[PDB]
Write a protein that binds this ligand. Structure first.
Ligand code: HEM
Ligand code: HEM
Ligand SMILES: Cc1cc(N)nc2cc(-c3ccc(OCC4CC4)c(CN)c3)ccc12
Ligand SMILES: Cc1cc(N)nc2cc(-c3ccc(OCC4CC4)c(CN)c3)ccc12
Ligand SMILES: C[C@H](O)[C@H](O)[C@H]1CNc2nc(N)[nH]c(=O)c2N1
Ligand SMILES: C[C@H](O)[C@H](O)[C@H]1CNc2nc(N)[nH]c(=O)c2N1
Ligand SMILES: [Cl-]
Ligand SMILES: [Cl-]
Ligand SMILES: [Gd]
Ligand SMILES: [Gd]
Ligand SMILES: [Gd]
Ligand SMILES: [Zn+2]
Lengths: 401, 401
């Protein structure tokens, strides 16, 4: 069992939970690939059995009559139909466990507080849209954000998948141009082109909210516009740099990832969007300052009258700090939930301690947990971590086009 | 052959050099341990033969002549004596190779410029001190720092080892009180008490340069006072914050690590101190702002009149950036070589590109290459990296007690 040291304090623990690692990652004794972004009834039964054991452990019914009854029933259903169905309480437990198990999520202190919307009866792309609208309305909650997931019907033999083609429920268009440059968010060029190809009339601003492309089983994707009053946005201003507001920058309240696959007990839910609230560095550092995103850093540094001709003036660091200040100030001014990277990493340290007592460890991806600015100023920098894959899980999946 | 992507540009390479990894790292298919600081004879001829082959490859002299001849003499030398002696040019080539192979070093663009002092004919703690003194004066060079390594004799069976007991050649003392808590550097509390427990009369200050504990084979260590004239230091001032100088902070010019073991062709040099020049974050972010180092961040924020009552003011980030500015400004004013983290990481990306075409890849430890502040503002953040062990190498070794 791997020994894990915290170098700030001197703490030492042993991750016994990693021995239960359900699947295999990309590393070998020869070479570590930890930094890479992208790392049959008998085996369905084996996964289902393990999940049922997890569930009956959680409700203190391990080895009970009800437990073996459920195991037998799942066995029988897989034999009769090639698959099985989760009970409502099992689905809620499995979705929370998937969040709990997500190695790259720093917000997991919240994992037990998750609103689970059961849309497994969804029949069409039109009903899917209605479920998604109510997810956005519930989770946004006029700025007092609430964590939620909506889970659409599972993958099943004989029918195609439900899929949301968008990577998030709220995204800004990226318009390719000539001179070659992108207007708007360069991360979203491909989905923007698909929306146009599917009949969307594009705008030409830098912050145009994309329509949704929703795919029902064995059907082409269908375009749905989000009511503007459902999409809460925050104009960005800085508390002391008054010219900052003239940049015309905005970001949206609700981070709602919609392109990942939820796996519970061998069953797969290719459409299950989930949302929480933002950590400010995701917006201020990555979305606004990445060179391949909005890339505002030099324009902000010039406006700040910093010396951008030499790197040792640390103009990049100074400008990025004030952009993050602007994000926090603006969301707080707008009364939209947001967490700075210091509070978030401190709460993640408490989660690690909670999980060491509860389960004997915690899967965590150091390079994703450590924030993209001020890394060693946060306590997670000094915490050794062990990365591994537990199920139930959120998994990446290929784009449906 | 692992596929490696840069996410800022979109470019892809394959690391074919990984296929040559020798020592097994700590990771397995089921769990990654990349964030851990410490990863948990006819064998001599195999490592010597391999290293000799490396040497003659690098000079286009594989496949006959002195290559064939050098192979037999190491064979005979080991057959006769059980060990072997490196030629001077091999010691030079091997030292540069171990530096080139160091996965955690961001300064490897410089790997070809290394001054190798051959101290293999040393045989007393008195000779060591003269060697270490030659190195420090040469490497310091009045502030125009020059990369250098001094190689004391290779370990051999039956006799003790040459070892430097200090982790670096220049370190600051750390002293306790009625309350354990430290005046000085907490990293060096252990060696401070060893030095005092060997004759050294302690100082009173927060920046007392420690003496050297030098260990000739099979003898107790011997204290040596470094000539103050030979330890170049930089008082810390800020370009616009007039009071920063009054904080009384200083740091030294030369980073010279002295507790690592140099391994070349199966031979082991437990005493082989190497030096370069600092990257400014090492001083300003880690040494001065780590909570378990000088922990000055709140003191600087009070002086800047920052609101330390809420994390979301980003007072930690602001104070940290100004400390790093003060380090860079002070070292440049003192005309002591230093490199900021933007310049250093940009050079490492050029190094990665050079190594791709020369050797087919480059062992790199993402968590150590990405700097401890402003990570995603540097290009290395967006570069996937592959970590593995090649020989020659610098290795960690246990403390000599
Ligand atoms: C409640 C507030 C939350 C915060 C502050 C938060 C924070 C974060 C952050 C900063 C990341 C890294 C993303 C990036 O760098 O681009 C992340 C990743 C992730 N989050 Fe959370 N999150 C929250 C809620 C949730 C919820 C409710 C779920 C699911 C139910 C979730 C699941 C995930 C997953 C699956 C990933 C990355 C996938 C992986 O591990 O490979 N998060 N989160
Ligand atoms: C010339 C300028 C150099 C710079 C700017 C530089 C910078 C750095 C930095 C920032 C680290 C990270 C360590 C930490 O953050 O605590 C490092 C590690 C390291 N450096 Fe360099 N360094 C330089 C020269 C050298 C030289 C000359 C050698 C040896 C001949 C060397 C060998 C190493 C080793 C062995 C490590 C630890 C790496 C590992 O364990 O894989 N460096 N360096
Ligand atoms: C619920 C939630 C809240 C939050 N506050 N943040 C979140 C960030 C991500 C996330 C996941 C993966 C990912 O990247 C995947 C790689 C592009 C394929 C990114 C973008 N870095 C963000 C996912 C969910 C989040
Ligand atoms: C030549 C050189 C230049 C430089 N500019 N920097 C350097 C930093 C280290 C180094 C290596 C390992 C290490 O960590 C060991 C762990 C504490 C036991 C630390 C301290 N973090 C520094 C080693 C050499 C360096
Ligand atoms: C190549 C590198 O793994 C990549 O840029 C990662 C690093 N760490 C990250 N960490 C978070 N939270 N989000 C990210 O997108 C990334 N990107
Ligand atoms: C736990 C973690 O591995 C540890 O804090 C590492 C992270 N990255 C680092 N990177 C550098 N350059 N130096 C360090 O000491 C560390 N410390
Ligand atoms: Cl985002
Ligand atoms: Cl140091
Ligand atoms: Gd102002
Ligand atoms: Gd402008
Ligand atoms: Gd004052
Ligand atoms: Zn690994």
């Amino acid at each position: 069992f791997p020994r894990v040291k915290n170098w700030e304090v001197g703490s030492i623990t042993y991750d016994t939970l990693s021995a239960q690692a359900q699947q295999d990652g990309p590393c070998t004794p020869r070479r570590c690939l930890g930094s890479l972004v992208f790392p049959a009834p008998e085996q369905l039964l084996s996964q289902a059995r393990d999940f049922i054991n997890q569930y009956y452990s959680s409700i203190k019914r391990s080895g009970s009559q009800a437990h073996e009854q459920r195991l037998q029933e799942v066995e029988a259903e897989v034999a009769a139909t090639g698959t099985y169905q989760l009970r409502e309480s099992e689905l809620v437990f499995g979705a929370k466990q998937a969040w709990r198990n997500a190695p790259r999520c720093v917000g997991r202190i919240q994992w037990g507080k998750l609103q689970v919307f059961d849309a497994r009866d969804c029949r069409s792309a039109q009903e899917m849209f209605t479920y998604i609208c109510n997810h956005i309305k519930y989770a946004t909650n006029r700025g007092n954000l609430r964590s939620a997931i909506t889970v659409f019907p599972q993958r099943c033999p004989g029918r195609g998948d439900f899929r949301i083609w968008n990577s998030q429920l709220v995204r800004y268009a990226g318009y390719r141009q000539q001179d070659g440059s992108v207007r708007g968010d360069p991360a979203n060029v491909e989905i923007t082109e698909l929306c146009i190809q599917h009949g969307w009339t594009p705008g030409n601003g830098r912050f145009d909210v994309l329509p949704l492309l929703l795919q029902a089983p064995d059907e082409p994707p269908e375009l749905f516009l989000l009511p503007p009053e459902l999409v809460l946005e925050v104009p960005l201003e800085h508390p002391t740099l008054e010219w900052f507001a003239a940049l015309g920058l905005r970001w949206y309240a609700l981070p709602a990832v919609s392109n990942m696959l939820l796996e519970i007990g061998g069953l797969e839910f290719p459409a299950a969007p989930f949302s929480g609230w933002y950590m400010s560095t995701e917006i201020g550092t990555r979305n606004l300052c990445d060179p391949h995103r909005y890339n505002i850093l030099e324009d902000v540094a010039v406006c700040m009258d910093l010396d951008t001709r030499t790197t040792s003036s640390l103009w990049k660091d100074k400008a990025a700090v004030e952009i993050n200040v602007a994000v926090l100030h603006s969301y707080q001014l707008a009364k939209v939930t947001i967490v700075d990277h210091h509070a978030a990493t401190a709460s993640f340290m408490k989660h690690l301690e909670n999980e060491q007592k509860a389960r004997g460890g915690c899967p965590a991806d150091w390079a994703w947990i450590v924030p993209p600015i001020s890394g060693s100023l946060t306590p997670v920098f000094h915490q050794e971590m062990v990365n591994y894959f537990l199920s139930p899980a959120f998994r990446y999946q290929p784009d449906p086009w």
